[PDB]
Ligand binder design. Sequence first.
Ligand SMILES: CCCCCCCC/C=C\CCCCCCCC(=O)O[C@@H](COC(=O)CCCCCCCCCCCCCCC)COP(=O)([O-])OCC[N+](C)(C)C
Ligand SMILES: CCCCCCCC/C=C\CCCCCCCC(=O)O[C@@H](COC(=O)CCCCCCCCCCCCCCC)COP(=O)([O-])OCC[N+](C)(C)C
Ligand SMILES: CCCCCCCC/C=C\CCCCCCCC(=O)O[C@@H](COC(=O)CCCCCCCCCCCCCCC)COP(=O)([O-])OCC[N+](C)(C)C
Ligand SMILES: CCCCCCCC/C=C\CCCCCCCC(=O)O[C@@H](COC(=O)CCCCCCCCCCCCCCC)COP(=O)([O-])OCC[N+](C)(C)C
Ligand SMILES: CCCCCCCC/C=C\CCCCCCCC(=O)O[C@@H](COC(=O)CCCCCCCCCCCCCCC)COP(=O)([O-])OCC[N+](C)(C)C
Ligand SMILES: CCCCCCCC/C=C\CCCCCCCC(=O)O[C@@H](COC(=O)CCCCCCCCCCCCCCC)COP(=O)([O-])OCC[N+](C)(C)C
Ligand SMILES: CCCCCCCC/C=C\CCCCCCCC(=O)O[C@@H](COC(=O)CCCCCCCCCCCCCCC)COP(=O)([O-])OCC[N+](C)(C)C
Ligand SMILES: CCCCCCCC/C=C\CCCCCCCC(=O)O[C@@H](COC(=O)CCCCCCCCCCCCCCC)COP(=O)([O-])OCC[N+](C)(C)C
Ligand SMILES: CCCCCCCC/C=C\CCCCCCCC(=O)O[C@@H](COC(=O)CCCCCCCCCCCCCCC)COP(=O)([O-])OCC[N+](C)(C)C
Ligand SMILES: CCCCCCCC/C=C\CCCCCCCC(=O)O[C@@H](COC(=O)CCCCCCCCCCCCCCC)COP(=O)([O-])OCC[N+](C)(C)C
Ligand SMILES: C[C@@H]1CC[C@@]2(OC1)O[C@H]1C[C@H]3[C@@H]4CC=C5C[C@@H](OCCC(CO)CO)CC[C@]5(C)[C@H]4CC[C@]3(C)[C@H]1[C@@H]2C
Ligand SMILES: CC(C)CCC[C@@H](C)[C@H]1CC[C@H]2[C@@H]3CC=C4C[C@@H](O)CC[C@]4(C)[C@H]3CC[C@]12C
Ligand SMILES: [NH3+]C1(Cc2ccc(Cl)cc2)CCN(c2ncnc3[nH]ccc23)CC1
Ligand SMILES: [NH3+]C1(Cc2ccc(Cl)cc2)CCN(c2ncnc3[nH]ccc23)CC1
Ligand SMILES: [Ca+2]
Lengths: 632, 172, 39
Amino acid sequence: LTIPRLEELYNTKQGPTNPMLFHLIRDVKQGNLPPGYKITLIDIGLVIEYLMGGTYRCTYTRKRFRLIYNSLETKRFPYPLNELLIWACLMKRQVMARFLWQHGEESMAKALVACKIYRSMAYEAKQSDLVDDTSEELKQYSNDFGQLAVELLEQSFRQDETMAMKLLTYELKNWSNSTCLKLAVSSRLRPFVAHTCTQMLLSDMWMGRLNMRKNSWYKVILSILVPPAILMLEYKTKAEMSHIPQSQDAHQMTMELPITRKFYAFYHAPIVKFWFNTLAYLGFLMLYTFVVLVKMEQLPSVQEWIVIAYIFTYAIEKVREVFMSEAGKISQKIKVWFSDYFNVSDTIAIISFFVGFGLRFGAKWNYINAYDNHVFVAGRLIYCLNIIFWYVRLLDFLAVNQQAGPYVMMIGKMVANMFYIVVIMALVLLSFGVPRKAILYPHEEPSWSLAKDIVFHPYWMIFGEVYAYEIDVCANDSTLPTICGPGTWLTPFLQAVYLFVQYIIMVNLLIAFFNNVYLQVKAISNIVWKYQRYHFIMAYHEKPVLPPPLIILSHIVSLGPKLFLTEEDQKKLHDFEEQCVEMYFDEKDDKFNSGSEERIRVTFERVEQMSIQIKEVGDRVNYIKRSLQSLD
Amino acid sequence: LPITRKFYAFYHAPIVKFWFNTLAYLGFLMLYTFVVLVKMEQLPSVQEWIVIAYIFTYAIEKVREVFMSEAGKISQKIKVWFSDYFNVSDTIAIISFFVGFGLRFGAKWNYINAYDNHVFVAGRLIYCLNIIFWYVRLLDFLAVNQQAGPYVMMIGKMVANMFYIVVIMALV
Amino acid sequence: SGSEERIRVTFERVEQMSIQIKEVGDRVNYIKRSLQSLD
Ligand SMILES: CCCCCCCC/C=C\CCCCCCCC(=O)O[C@@H](COC(=O)CCCCCCCCCCCCCCC)COP(=O)([O-])OCC[N+](C)(C)C
Ligand SMILES: CCCCCCCC/C=C\CCCCCCCC(=O)O[C@@H](COC(=O)CCCCCCCCCCCCCCC)COP(=O)([O-])OCC[N+](C)(C)C
Ligand SMILES: CCCCCCCC/C=C\CCCCCCCC(=O)O[C@@H](COC(=O)CCCCCCCCCCCCCCC)COP(=O)([O-])OCC[N+](C)(C)C
Ligand SMILES: CCCCCCCC/C=C\CCCCCCCC(=O)O[C@@H](COC(=O)CCCCCCCCCCCCCCC)COP(=O)([O-])OCC[N+](C)(C)C
Ligand SMILES: CCCCCCCC/C=C\CCCCCCCC(=O)O[C@@H](COC(=O)CCCCCCCCCCCCCCC)COP(=O)([O-])OCC[N+](C)(C)C
Ligand SMILES: CCCCCCCC/C=C\CCCCCCCC(=O)O[C@@H](COC(=O)CCCCCCCCCCCCCCC)COP(=O)([O-])OCC[N+](C)(C)C
Ligand SMILES: CCCCCCCC/C=C\CCCCCCCC(=O)O[C@@H](COC(=O)CCCCCCCCCCCCCCC)COP(=O)([O-])OCC[N+](C)(C)C
Ligand SMILES: CCCCCCCC/C=C\CCCCCCCC(=O)O[C@@H](COC(=O)CCCCCCCCCCCCCCC)COP(=O)([O-])OCC[N+](C)(C)C
Ligand SMILES: CCCCCCCC/C=C\CCCCCCCC(=O)O[C@@H](COC(=O)CCCCCCCCCCCCCCC)COP(=O)([O-])OCC[N+](C)(C)C
Ligand SMILES: CCCCCCCC/C=C\CCCCCCCC(=O)O[C@@H](COC(=O)CCCCCCCCCCCCCCC)COP(=O)([O-])OCC[N+](C)(C)C
Ligand SMILES: C[C@@H]1CC[C@@]2(OC1)O[C@H]1C[C@H]3[C@@H]4CC=C5C[C@@H](OCCC(CO)CO)CC[C@]5(C)[C@H]4CC[C@]3(C)[C@H]1[C@@H]2C
Ligand SMILES: CC(C)CCC[C@@H](C)[C@H]1CC[C@H]2[C@@H]3CC=C4C[C@@H](O)CC[C@]4(C)[C@H]3CC[C@]12C
Ligand SMILES: [NH3+]C1(Cc2ccc(Cl)cc2)CCN(c2ncnc3[nH]ccc23)CC1
Ligand SMILES: [NH3+]C1(Cc2ccc(Cl)cc2)CCN(c2ncnc3[nH]ccc23)CC1
Ligand SMILES: [Ca+2]
């Protein structure tokens, strides 16, 4: 495999081609395509970097290759089975891609690349206007390699858990210094991230140096409030921290416990940052609850100032998260941060607060007895509504637990699914409300109170209220005797039908909906919860040590983690990989050639043969004795 | 494409006729909701006339659907059209309206302070009950969706199935 | 007495008997070659 041959393999029409490769060559060159165009590997590299996304950089687009390519051993490649795997996948040649995948090294990595490349071509095929979409074909090819990567990880995990966790985090050096666990996140390949092995790793990254089988959360919270109790905690040895990726400054300190080291290990663990923010967030709500319930004067109280400080500094910390994320382009930094329910809510919560502060604070205190100054009122009322956002953000903290977190994810999924049942209920409501109002209140002029009256009491009927003494307004126990008139005897009949429909049909249908959909939503929600632990835990490695009142100093002073292996440990790891791939194919053949469906049929074939042979004996064996009848 | 062709393709697509009827049907209910909640005088309002026009012309369009169906014999044209829940309901809704219009409109306005004229009252009260039919027809439009439509069909099937449990409850 | 166990010991014997009939099929040819040659 040389460069000129590998050119020809992309530039050939004498075989099954991908019609959409050329449609991708255009977009990376932005318009230019002569009819006699011979594809070049510089142009293939730009397709790959486009498809793989992020900050991926192919070896075709580097200084070393661009020179030797223009110049033209050296035209060879060191790893040609990688160059052909990409070819077979860009050309939509799955049977060739599977074959070439089995040959070479780094099998689990190559499978996660292939999953990514097909997934990205499937998306462009949706977004493009062609005769055959081919996208369910490519989406099928992506999930085939994705299933292989998962099956190899389970194989490695059953052999050695610690070495399997190392496999998720070593750099690859032929795949743009990337990581198998990063490639799977890029493809949203969830059974791999929801797998026991990498959940075990995220839980060890959560600890840091802290050994949290001996310790308990009683003593971490204590040690945050009682700093000198940091010294009486059990930590981990460098040997126990070997499969865990670390920062530069971390490994230095682990390499050299000294007193100052034992503090550093504590305040830079993600678990400690969590509780150290959590406690500050709860102290925040207590005050903002005190401020909103207690009378507010012209000048803010000491409680209110502390609240303004937190939200101001909290907002600053959200800006840096945007402009320091894994995506390298702004528009990607934006869309991904707004892909989280509670980051959207914090954006509204922050913006709405300072509107309210502006009115509350920038209001001209014409003394009148406040709540005669209506600009002050609007400011305070925005606070009273904004605090709802900050209670609901507690569900973000609570979802860190294994039991609570999936239920928090179910609540969103079920609101989406119960939508149309609730639309029908809202129709039954108006079907009742409009006649009830029209019959009982005929002498009315137009007003926006009509819009409340057709909707108000019918809604409250769903929730256990009957308005017993308002039914039959002409009765003696009625509370609406001025409303008795012609045609009011109809409204009890109407309401009897209304509640029959809402409870006996529609509430119980909704109960029946949930009972019959609970399991598969719960199952999806557990996998989704596990996939998102990654984005959650990997953020705390980048967050500062101080929480959002005192973080301001960490910002001013300020103005990823990597897995390190010595060479013998890289050697032991590449051997672990090869061995576990061999075991995988072997056990696959054995299970196949040990099943009844496979033994019945190879028996079926031999018996068919042996039938022919005994006949091929039966004719001949007659023909033996004919001598001892004739020769004799 | 030619300009006039590109309009023809639009106004003769079934999706476009649907939303173009749907929006007119919603504008219809808004007015008939305004008419039924706001005080009614001797002479109909501009809102009420528009409502009478829609139901009159709506009725005409239902007649042609009957006499232009795939069945070629009248008695088959009839039975098949009445095989739909909401076409039966529209038949009652249309007939009941013009009874109410007759009383509301053909009533001798002996001035007395209306709601002393009891023929006017019956007319108005039929409107207030007839509008229920026209909210429930919105379930016919909503059943065009894949998620909502089956639930609309379940509601009918379950009323039929829960019948005897409800008879026992009525006995208790 | 189970099918998974009877299918497989059947699977093994049939593999053996295939070898034997062949170990007959070569030999049984080699019998009649007398009554073509000896005769
Ligand atoms: C927010 C970000 C940082 C996070 C930490 C924040 C904590 C900061 C801590 C303390 C700061 C408190 C302010 C001091 C005010 C003293 C004023 C005084 O004289 O005495 C006051 C005592 O104070 C009160 O009554 C105020 C209510 C206390 C609420 C405490 C909740 C949070 C505690 C944290 C728990 C966290 C535990 C972890 C979670 C489980 C008397 O009341 P008053 O206020 O004068 O009443 C108004 C009367 N007037 C206007 C007529 C005069
Ligand atoms: C990652 C994404 C999330 C984060 C995004 C960050 C978004 C930031 C959030 C929100 C910014 C936008 C909200 C609008 C601002 C207030 C407007 C207002 O009402 O002004 C008022 C006056 O103003 C004052 O009296 C001055 C006080 C306001 C300055 C402090 C808040 C805004 C500045 C930024 C601070 C936060 C910066 C945070 C740094 C990041 C006008 O009302 P008034 O004068 O009372 O009118 C009548 C007066 N009269 C009665 C005398 C006639
Ligand atoms: C001066 C006062 C100071 C002290 C007071 C303050 C004390 C602190 C406050 C509360 C006590 C909480 C203790 C729970 C910890 C148990 C251990 C555990 O398993 O943790 C899990 C919980 O992980 C979380 O993140 C839980 C959520 C945090 C608190 C949420 C506040 C809002 C809840 C209230 C809203 C309703 C309110 C209505 C009623 C008022 C995570 O672990 P796991 O995934 O199961 O796996 C084990 C992993 N690990 C152990 C290595 C982490
Ligand atoms: C008034 C007349 C009646 C109307 C009222 C209506 C009220 C409604 C109000 C509020 C409900 C709004 C929730 C919308 C969520 C939609 C997003 C979603 O589907 O899930 C996403 C977020 O996943 C999560 O985990 C989100 C968790 C948020 C919980 C918020 C609860 C707020 C409680 C407030 C308490 C305050 C109460 C007191 C206030 C004073 C996950 O996305 P997905 O997985 O792709 O989802 C597809 C799902 N599917 C494929 C299964 C279909
Ligand atoms: C269902 C089987 C048949 C059963 C038996 C027969 C029942 C069936 C038919 C007929 C019964 C209708 C007449 C009842 C009159 C008695 C009340 C009365 O005296 O006057 C009434 C006035 O009312 C009117 O002026 C007209 C009322 C009827 C018009 C609306 C028809 C609604 C039902 C049509 C569709 C139904 C179909 C539903 C099918 C499921 C009430 O007013 P008042 O009492 O005079 O109040 C005076 C107050 N003041 C002193 C302040 C001024
Ligand atoms: C139905 C079949 C066709 C379908 C379209 C129908 C639409 C036709 C459109 C417009 C026609 C409106 C009639 C004009 C009357 C003007 C009178 C006047 O001077 O001003 C009036 C303004 O008008 C009102 O207040 C009437 C209420 C408006 C209801 C609009 C709902 C439908 C809008 C369509 C939305 C569709 C959107 C799509 C759906 C999402 C003042 O009030 P009034 O009435 O004088 O009050 C009685 C007072 N008096 C008796 C004491 C004097
Ligand atoms: C596909 C199947 C579905 C479609 C089927 C179609 C079915 C059509 C639907 C219904 C038709 C049958 C309903 C009955 C008619 C009203 C009777 C009535 O009350 O008259 C009243 C008077 O009448 C008037 O004052 C004249 C106004 C009525 C004419 C307009 C409606 C009927 C004509 C057809 C228009 C729609 C045609 C639509 C074209 C298709 C009598 O009441 P009164 O005079 O007040 O009595 C006392 C008076 N006093 C106080 C002075 C003593
Ligand atoms: C297919 C069928 C089509 C034809 C239907 C034909 C039906 C047409 C029927 C009848 C026409 C009647 C007109 C004349 C009435 C004579 C009485 C009178 O004048 O005065 C009396 C009116 O008292 C009433 O109750 C009148 C209203 C009852 C009508 C009920 C209709 C039911 C429709 C059901 C819907 C069916 C829908 C079915 C759809 C499938 C007394 O009142 P007053 O003197 O005016 O008041 C002065 C009182 N003061 C002392 C307070 C001042
Ligand atoms: C000036 C003002 C103008 C604008 C305002 C008016 C805006 C319009 C009004 C409402 C917004 C509706 C938007 C839905 C469309 C989504 C696309 C879709 O999938 O369509 C589906 C919905 O098909 C239907 O037919 C839906 C029902 C129509 C509206 C029903 C009104 C009654 C509901 C209210 C009752 C409760 C009321 C209580 C609360 C008030 C059909 O498609 P599908 O089978 O899923 O497959 C896709 C096929 N397709 C896309 C090719 C079609
Ligand atoms: C008061 C004391 C208590 C009594 C009150 C009782 C009240 C009852 C009132 C109303 C309920 C009446 C519905 C009857 C439907 C029967 C037809 C049917 O079975 O389905 C058919 C139509 O299929 C559909 O999809 C029909 C959908 C119509 C929904 C109407 C809801 C009205 C809501 C109104 C809201 C207004 C509320 C406010 C008003 C002011 C399909 O036929 P099928 O598939 O062959 O069915 C066989 C089923 N099986 C084989 C499974 C067995
Ligand atoms: C499908 C859905 C059902 C039907 C429906 O929605 C769609 O159709 C809408 C039409 C609405 C009315 C249109 C115009 C006005 C005039 C306005 O006049 C100000 C007077 C005074 C205020 O103090 C200042 O002078 C008052 C409100 C009113 C009557 C609307 C009420 C709500 C109605 C009935 C709505 C109803 C819920
Ligand atoms: C219509 C306007 C003018 C009046 C007030 C509207 C009501 C419905 C508004 C005001 C405050 C709002 C709440 C503010 C905050 C949140 C938290 C969020 O996670 C879910 C929605 C939720 C719970 C909102 C629901 C709708 C809400 C209750
Ligand atoms: N952050 C959440 C919850 C969570 C999960 C795990 C831990 Cl360890 C802690 C908290 C809550 C928002 N969510 C989300 N928001 C919006 N749309 C979505 N689509 C998929 C997931 C989400 C993603 C998880
Ligand atoms: N028209 C409906 C609902 C519907 C279905 C599909 C679309 Cl795309 C739009 C609306 C509502 C009445 N129905 C019906 N009515 C009475 N008896 C029956 N037996 C079987 C069906 C029906 C037939 C479907
Ligand atoms: Ca109750």
